Amino acid sequence: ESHIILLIQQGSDPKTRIWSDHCSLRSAIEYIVGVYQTNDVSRFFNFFDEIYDCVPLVYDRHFRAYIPHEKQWLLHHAQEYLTAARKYDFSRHCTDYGHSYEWPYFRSLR
Amino acid sequence: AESHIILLIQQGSDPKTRIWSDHCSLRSAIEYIVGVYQTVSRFFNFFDEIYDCVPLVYDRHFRAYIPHEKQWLLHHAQEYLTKYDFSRHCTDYGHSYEWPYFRSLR
């Protein structure tokens, strides 16, 4: 029952907003990396830092609520993900579910 | 203040139509979702055509967002009343730096 939502805003204009939901932290990291690869590591963190706003929300099983984190929180996890391995399109793999009907919170209400 | 509401919106079946709005009060979220409709029995059909809408309501103590079903925003929009540009007034802030949670840890 892991669920992570990324509130992404590409530029200073809120018109560029898009959100992604994933079933695990690895899926969230693989998503944002796959977004950068729609066109190096250090150049990737250049791309990540250029994102105007990106606040992750992680779901808590017991409290049944989403914990907000800073943009730096996803930086640290993405950093250690890339160590163990050895126009941008933000809709690429931007969801592991078809509808919020499938999210862990809404399934528990049945 | 410490009141924040996030609307996770997906217009069509394709997740490319995803957009999220954040507001400082429940009234602002309702006024926003009404403002996008006008860009009144047809308002029900507009809101029902939205493929997915998850309101996230912030709790000041627990410092977490409470997920709600789409009907929770519909019912509050109904009380307020007694193609579409979902970017119109879609934020009461300029950055999440101004949100109540991120102001709380200062």
Sequence ranges of the domains in chain A? 1-110
* A53: its two tokens: 């706003």
* CA B27 from centroid of its chain's CA atoms: 10
Does the CA dihedral B64-B70-B76-B81 come out positive or negative?
positive
CA distance B94 to B67: 23
In order of A37, B34, B39, B97, the CA distances from B88 in angstroms are 31, 10, 9, 21
CA–CA min distance A86, chain B (Å): 32
Q: How far off is chain A from B72, nearest CA to CA, in Å? A: 13
Report d(CA B22, CA B19) in Å as an integer: 10
Which of B23, B20, B29, B15 has the alpha carbon at shortest distance from B79?
Answer: B29
Angstrom distance (rounded) from CA A30 to CA A51: 16
- Locate A44 and state its tokens: 């990737």
B26 to chain A, minimum CA–CA distance in Å?
18
SS3 label, residue B70: helix
Question: Could you give the residue ranges of the DSSP H alpha helices within A1-110?
Answer: 25-36, 42-50, 71-84, 104-108
Specify the DSSP element, H or E, that contains A55: strand A53-60
Chain A CB contacts of B52 below 8 Å: 99-100
B21 chain-A contacts, CB cut-off 8 A: 17
DSSP string for residues in B39-66? --THHHHHHHH-SEEEEEEEETTTTEEE
Between CA B8 and CA A110 the distance in angstroms is 22
Give how far A47 is from chain B: nearest CA, Å: 18
Tell me if B11 sits within 8 A of B33, measured CB to CB.
no
Contacts of A38 (CB under 8 A, 6+ apart): A87, A88, A89, A92
B82 burial (CB, 10 Å; 0-12 / 13-18 / 19+) is: exposed
- How many CB atoms neighbour CB A57 within 10 A? 22
- Cα four-point dihedral sign B70, A8, A89, A1: negative
* Angle subtended at Cα B86 by Cα B44 and Cα A69, rounded to the nearest 5 degrees: 110
How many other β-carbons are positioned within 10 Å of the β-carbon of residue B45?
8
A67 and chain B in contact, CB less than 8 A: yes
Beta bridge partners of B21: B7
Of A19, A63, A70, the CB nearest to B8: A19
Contacts of A94 in chain B (CB under 8 A): 15, 18
What sign has the CA pseudo-torsion B44, B47, B50, B51? negative
Beta strand B5-10 with B18-23 is antiparallel
Q: Is B6 on the interface with A (CB under 8 A)?
A: yes
Torsion angle in degrees (nearest 10) through CA of A53, A54, A59, A65: 0
> The tokens 């939901």 sit on which residue?
A21
Under an 8 A CB cutoff, do B18 and A18 touch?
A: yes
